[PDB]
């Protein structure tokens, strides 16, 4: 299978530098153009830049021209995006794609531009023939967080709400599941919360 894998994403200071990287696998980047396309939170796809690796010719979107640099290396079968002079506007999921349209895309890497430093979440229970229970995952930066129930055993009737950015600048969300109350006391209920940016892991057992 053709496959494109992004890496190098993460949390940068305004004005800082970060180098994304796109490893192509299942074809030769000599044979095609490589683009970067990004998507700001809750916004549309925006084309960033392209390169013809064979001769290294490069075209840019005007919002990034002079700050970003696209480049490729045929021998490593890999494309790059050198992001400089980063602004809050640049916070986005950055995808990698090839060309006769964009048939294969990478998974995406999150770049977040902010001055706010890393903070792990506090995690609090939402205590309860149907019952509702859950976890409050509060005061973390940056996004993302992972919330599982019973190490992934429980997925039916689960609702993990998108994070809100609070006035503090710290994110907060809530994860909830709906069960028959006949099951209460018979099943044990644990939310697993993982915030990799912080190196924070938390398991909270939720009981009335």
């Amino acid at each position: 299978e053709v496959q494109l894998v992004e890496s190098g994403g993460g949390l940068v200071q305004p004005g800082g530098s970060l180098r994304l990287s796109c490893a192509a696998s299942g074809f030769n980047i000599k044979d095609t153009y490589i683009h970067w396309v990004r998507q700001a939170p809750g916004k549309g796809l925006e084309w960033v830049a392209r390169i013809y690796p064979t001769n290294g010719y490069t075209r840019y979107a005007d919002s990034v021209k002079g700050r970003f640099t696209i480049s490729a290396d045929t021998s490593k079968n890999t494309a790059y995006l050198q992001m400089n002079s980063l602004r809050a506007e640049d916070t986005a999921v950055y995808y990698c794609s090839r060309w006769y349209a964009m048939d294969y895309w990478g998974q995406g890497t999150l770049v977040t531009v902010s001055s706010a430093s890393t903070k792990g979440p506090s995690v609090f229970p939402l205590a309860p023939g149907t019952a509702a229970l859950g976890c409050l995952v509060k005061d973390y930066f940056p996004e993302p967080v992972t919330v599982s129930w019973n190490s992934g055993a429980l997925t039916s009737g689960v609702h993990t709400f998108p994070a809100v950015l609070q006035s503090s600048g710290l994110y907060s969300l809530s994860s909830v599941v709906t069960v028959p109350s006949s099951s209460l006391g018979t099943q044990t209920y644990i939310c697993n919360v993982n915030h990799k940016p912080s190196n924070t892991k938390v398991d909270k057992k939720v009981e009335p």
Binding site: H35, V37, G44, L45, E46, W47, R50, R59, A61, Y95, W99, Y100, A101, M102, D103, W105, G106, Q107, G108, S122, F124, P125, L126, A127, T130, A132, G134, L136, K138, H159, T160, F161, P162, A163, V164, Q166, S172, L173, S174, V176, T178
Partner: protein, 214 residues
């Protein structure tokens, strides 16, 4: 520079329906038009290329048509699986340019919410802040009003809402409303109430608790 003007911004249609999304080019783009499907929080998948060709492994329900500068995506019998944001692109010139996208909402039958109210946990209380959490579960459509009644008074701008994406199996949304109050401010008042209006309840429904009391 060539602009692609995609319409409509957002659309609701029922399972089985024949949905039509347009995109007009600012200049002749010959055939150099593609269509993508992006699922909430995933990468776009290519649907249609050179304006009218079905891409590998895309369902036969998806079709693509050109008429001058006007380009059309047609989903013939809308499935639940086809819940997504859809983007036309032109690649005639550099830069290649994407439409603003169109969000395809599945219209289903009206569903009142299940409402639940969650007092702060004891763990959060002893930290100095209190989050009262109100859950509105499995409703359609997405439009709902939630007012908080702390000591029988309305609240303003001390509340944050968040709503899930349309579920894959039952097409409903859930919503969360979270009242943020100081430990001190919180302890002050007795009744805490979450009052909901929605098209599918006759009268507004209130769920409440009395601070601390089981």
């Amino acid at each position: 520079d060539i602009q692609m003007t995609q319409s409509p911004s957002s659309l609701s249609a029922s399972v089985g329906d024949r949905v039509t999304i347009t995109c007009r080019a600012s200049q002749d783009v010959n055939t150099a038009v593609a269509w993508y499907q992006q699922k909430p929080g995933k990468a776009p998948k290519l649907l249609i290329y050179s304006a009218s060709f079905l891409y590998s492994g895309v369902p036969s329900r998806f079709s693509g048509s050109r008429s001058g500068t006007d380009f059309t995506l047609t989903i013939s019998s809308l499935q639940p699986e086809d819940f997504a944001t859809y983007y036309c692109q032109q690649h005639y010139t550099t830069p290649p340019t994407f439409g603003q996208g169109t969000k395809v909402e599945i219209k289903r039958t009206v569903a009142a919410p299940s409402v639940f109210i969650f007092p702060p946990s004891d763990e959060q209380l002893k930290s100095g802040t209190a989050s009262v959490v109100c859950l509105l579960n499995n409703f359609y459509p997405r439009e709902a009003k939630v007012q908080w009644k702390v000591d029988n008074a309305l609240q303003s701008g001390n509340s944050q809402e968040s709503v899930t994406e349309q579920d894959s199996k039952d097409s409903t949304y859930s919503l969360s409303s979270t009242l943020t109050l100081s430990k001190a401010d919180y302890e002050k008042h007795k009744v805490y109430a979450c009052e909901v209006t929605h098209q599918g309840l006759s009268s507004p429904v209130t769920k409440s608790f009395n601070r601390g009391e089981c």
